[PDB]
Amino acid sequence: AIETILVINKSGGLIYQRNFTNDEQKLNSNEYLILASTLHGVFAIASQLTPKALQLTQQTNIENTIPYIPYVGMSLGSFKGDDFFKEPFTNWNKSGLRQLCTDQFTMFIYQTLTGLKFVAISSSVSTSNLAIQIADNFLRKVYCLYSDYVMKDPSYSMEMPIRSNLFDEKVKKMVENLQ
Amino acid sequence: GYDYDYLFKIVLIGDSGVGKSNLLSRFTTDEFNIESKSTIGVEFATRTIEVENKKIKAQIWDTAGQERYRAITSAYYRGAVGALIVYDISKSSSYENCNHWLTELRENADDNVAVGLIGNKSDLAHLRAVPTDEAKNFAMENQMLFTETSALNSDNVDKAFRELIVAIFQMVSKHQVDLSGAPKGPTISLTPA
Amino acid sequence: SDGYEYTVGPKQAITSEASYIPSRIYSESLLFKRQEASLSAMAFLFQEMISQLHRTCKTAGDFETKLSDYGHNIGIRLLELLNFRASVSPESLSNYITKMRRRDLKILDILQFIHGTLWSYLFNHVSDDLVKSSERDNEYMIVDNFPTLTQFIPGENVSCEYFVCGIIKGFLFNAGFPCGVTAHRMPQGGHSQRTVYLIQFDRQVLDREG
Amino acid sequence: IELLNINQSTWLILQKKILQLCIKVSRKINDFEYVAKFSSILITKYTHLLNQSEQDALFKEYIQPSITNESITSYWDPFILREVVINRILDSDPTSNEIPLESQEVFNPFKVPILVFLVGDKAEFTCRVQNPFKFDFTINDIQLDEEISEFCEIDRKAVSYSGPYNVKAESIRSITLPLIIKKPTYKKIYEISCLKISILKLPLQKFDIINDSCIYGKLKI
Amino acid sequence: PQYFAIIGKKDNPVYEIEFTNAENPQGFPQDLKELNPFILHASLDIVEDLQWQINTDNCYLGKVDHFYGLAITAYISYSGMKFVMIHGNSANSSVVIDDNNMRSFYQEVHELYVKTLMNPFYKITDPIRSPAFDSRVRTLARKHLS
Amino acid sequence: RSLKAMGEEIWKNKTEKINTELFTLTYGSIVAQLCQDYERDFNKVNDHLYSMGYNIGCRLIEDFLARTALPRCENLVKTSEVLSKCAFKIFLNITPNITNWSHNKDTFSLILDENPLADFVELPMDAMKSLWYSNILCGVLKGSLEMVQLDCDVWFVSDILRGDSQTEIKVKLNRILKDEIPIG
């Protein structure tokens, strides 16, 4: 049950913080900017903490591929068909923060090649490896939806807050399907 | 409270020990996660101001690199549309490092970034070591605004910060227009059989 | 250089000259070459057009007028080769047809034509429920339950949709029916992206038809 | 003329044909008013259609009698004399005649010429008169204004001595004249674009400056 | 000889051309040459009269107007573009128009006009200045007219 | 399948399609009204179309790479292959070829066999030597490649509308700027 989705534009800074919990509203808008910027900084820290053993020898370019789930999304815009993608896809952030485990929630992070960051907080604590695949598939779902309804928007400056009407309701429906 | 139309990223960079932490004591919402400077490298402050009838949120990143932050400090200028170079008029080393800081900003920060110069601890006229004329002349060649700030001389940095945000908003603001007798009654079908 | 040259006037074209200066626009046919492209390219061209139009305009009315002018020319072009091109009955295709399509000259024949073939050609599906408000004198309207070009535009305001309004206006204007075409949003029926193109004819057309 | 849109129809050839017939009949009867009236239209609107022969014959036949008997007292179009640049030149060395000089913060870098003259110095007035038509006409005299006149008006004696200024057929031929300055101005930046001209011995008519395309060429003295 | 013109809604010609028979390469001798635009202007009124009338085809009107041994045929496109031809005898005859040939000629010339109109830079008011258009129109006249 | 059948499958059944005559008519209307606005200064029209294409490409780099999610191109060959074999395929029904490889593998040309933008086009006689009609594509390529930290220069050298038979777009990589976020 993904209870909160937030996205960081390219350089830190928050542009979308719609949450789907029943009623908590504990964190004001101001603190969530600090949370997102801290996440970006911690991502940067995590990039430069690889162990010495793996820096000179990776030999692991077979596990980066994400297996695809059939219908994780729902049950479209520029896309067409029963789903946004049927094929398996590859990981981009092979040297960055990927999730955060906690006994009360689990945070997943999916970084676009360009730099867009999509963060999903789920109340559910899966073998702690399949859930990565579920989260990556769902977040690429959300990224495709964003590329549809936020990028093809004349009244939207780049890397600024996403004040739109179709995008938020469609991601709300998408997360409602996934539970 | 997601009402702000624009989110500008500003970096408060300067020499260690200059007194940046006291410099951003005013333009803040003094709450939220305090410290965290030594943990990741930055502390965060925010300001809200209206310009041309449009709410603007400005996020201030007061980065500093002591011994550990080589690549991360560079990465923290990924999209900063503003900079607030700081030096103290007590020791010439801080003013000398301004060219090095500006070189890093213009090399790594966002293209055509609006960057300014702040002279902190100007109340202490006893140990002055950098004149206003030289600082202004250095600002002229590099397209920067320049000011001097002090605890007794407060409320100047606030005006300079608002003026910097206004300068930014006149550069990264796409022009827009305020987009804001329909038929009524029972219709009758007219589609062909 | 013997092309009309209207200042001089008509020229003597002796009927013994077959010398042919290929043009690359007259030789090419226009039959119906299917080259369907992605909706994404159309959407991005559309939104960049509107973005460029924001800086040039000053008010909402000027924005709508300039967008309608943009679509007007597309209407000018589309009228001819949607009326003409439908006359083909299953090199030049002029000598493939025995009978030109009967050009419409009535109040509702053109609106049926737009409902049927123009909208299908534009958006690959016939438009929905062409109706008229039969109260005042004349309020004819074309309603689409889910417009294609402006589906990505957020908000409840209809200002970016005047492009197809201009297309329709140019179509009827060349066809011999001046109009006051304008769009409105009428969310009804569970779609809620429902747009109605109210069409208002001039007194001249009303006098001509009766 | 009412049937067409001489003053719904944009067939220029037919319009000029009927207008030619109108002037021909208007001369057939002794009606010297409408000959001028319609020749004014025929060499203001349909000027880019009558070639050398038609314009030359029409100017010889219907225009010059229409001027000698004072039937029309205004020039055809206002699109004459595109540039009116004025200059002064230092006769002696540059040192000779100088124009007198006329006796904590927050810095940010984020935010046509005017001519000056003395009483005694001599100036140079140059204007680029144009002749869009295929015939030749002659300018008789040139004057500046009523307001900025009495200050720096062109020497009447000089233009009178120089005689009429003939303009070639399709030229932008220029006229260079002297100029005399008599009165001061203290501190009042006046403007100069009135520039009365007489063409083919007509009343002095105003002509405002028009550049290459509608923008006005204005200068201050 | 033949005199052909394409006229827009504002009653202005966007194209004009005259054809001959190649044994008398002079066109209309001197007087009908001056009178052609006026008679075509007159016939445009009848063409506009037939533009909105019920009673098959309605784009090709055939012989609509008559003058001193001159047959006048009109064809109307979908954008109100009027295609008008004036047929003249060979200095003595009663001119009879070939229905199928004139129909096909107007069809192909309408093809030319529509594919001229399609390009971005053309405007309805502007005239059809193009050597290719004139060349293909005149070889078309050879093909279909006579 | 490397890239051919991949892009073929995506265009076959992944994307909602629209008629291209509408696309070329729209682009023609923009270009014509732009030339009217700018008073026949076709160099400025080229600059404006370049800016428009740059904005479009900066926005477009998400649509591609969200539908495809191909890995980062390594060096100057996979990028050309993808860009000419599926990037154009997904958005348009065209599969341009690669030609004129430079001696040191730094420049390549996109021979555009079909140009849907210039479908019904015939330039005015006073612009056959100045106006690059489909200048939006160069801006799109420039911005789109810059957004993946692959800054380069893109320009026309010949067009079918102007003179020579073949139309080609030369793409020359200046440098791979290393501001490409903490990955890899």
Ligand SMILES: *C(=O)CCCCCCCCCCCCCCC
């Ligand atoms: C390797 O670095 C990946 C390269 C990504 C190539 C992206 C190219 C997308 C744009 C293609 C042109 C489409 C034209 C659309 C016209 C509106």
